[PDB]
Amino acid sequence: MVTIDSPVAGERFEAGKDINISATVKSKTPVSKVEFYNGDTLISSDTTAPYTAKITGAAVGAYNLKAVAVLSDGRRIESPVTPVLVKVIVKPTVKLTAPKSNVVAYGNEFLKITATASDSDGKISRVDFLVDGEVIGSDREAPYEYEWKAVEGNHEISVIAYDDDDAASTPDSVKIFVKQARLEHHHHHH
Ligand SMILES: [Ca+2]
Ligand SMILES: [Ca+2]
Numbered sequence: 001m002v003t004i005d006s007p008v009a010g011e012r013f014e015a016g017k018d019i020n021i022s023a024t025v026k027s028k029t030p031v032s033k034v035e036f037y038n039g040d041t042l043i044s045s046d047t048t049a050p051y052t053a054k055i056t057g058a059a060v061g062a063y064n065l066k067a068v069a070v071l072s073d074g075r076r077i078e079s080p081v082t083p084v085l086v087k088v089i090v091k092p093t094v095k096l097t098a099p100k101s102n103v104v105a106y107g108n109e110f111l112k113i114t115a116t117a118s119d120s121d122g123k124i125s126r127v128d129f130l131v132d133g134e135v136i137g138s139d140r141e142a143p144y145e146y147e148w149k150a151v152e153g154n155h156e157i158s159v160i161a162y163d164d165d166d167a168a169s170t171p172d173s174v175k176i177f178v179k180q181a182r183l184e185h186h187h188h189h190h
């Protein structure tokens with residue numbers, strides 16, 4: 001059989017970048033060459049393992065990639081189509097809605113982090129929640145929320161959204177201070 005190893009079906013690329021194509025051949029007969037196609041159009045052919053091709057500066061649109069091994073006895077075997085997409089990529093945006101920088105929090109108490117996320121061209125796949133740069137949880141469904149067991153001291157809470165192209169937003173962050181659990185005092189309210 002002949003397999004296209006990369007890219008994988010359904011992969012999305014950015015307009016103007018390159019698509020590099022790799023094929024593996026399994027056959028009892030030695031391979032003369034592997035031809036690489038986009039639809040019916042020959043990209044290029046490769047007489048040597050590893051079998052590679054490259055579409056340089058790919059324009060937007062669908063690419064229907066196939067590899068064909070030409071074997072030493074004249075036979076041809078072919079991969080299935082690997083269909084990929086080249087598009088304009090537009091990163092999502094994220095906004096941290098809680099906590100605020102002046103949050104009153106204590107060590108060991110759970111503190112709810114919340115965010116909104118938007119993608120202008122596509123959709124949000126998930127929001128990741130981070131504390132001092134470390135992912136503590138993800139939420140795949142709006143509303144975006146995570147309950148963090150608070151850790152005493154100064155911490156930076158951030159969120160990063162990921163879209164359906166796996167493009168990440170820039171992070172949105174807040175700096176907070178978490179008090180020692182022993183310093184929780186009465187505070188009047190109504
Ligand atoms: Ca080669
Ligand atoms: Ca997007």
Ligand SMILES: [Ca+2]
Nearest residue numbers: 139141142143
């Ligand atoms: Ca949720």
Ligand SMILES: [Ca+2]
Nearest residue numbers: 095096172173
């Ligand atoms: Ca903000």
Ligand SMILES: [Cl-]
Nearest residue numbers: 107152180181
């Ligand atoms: Cl503490």
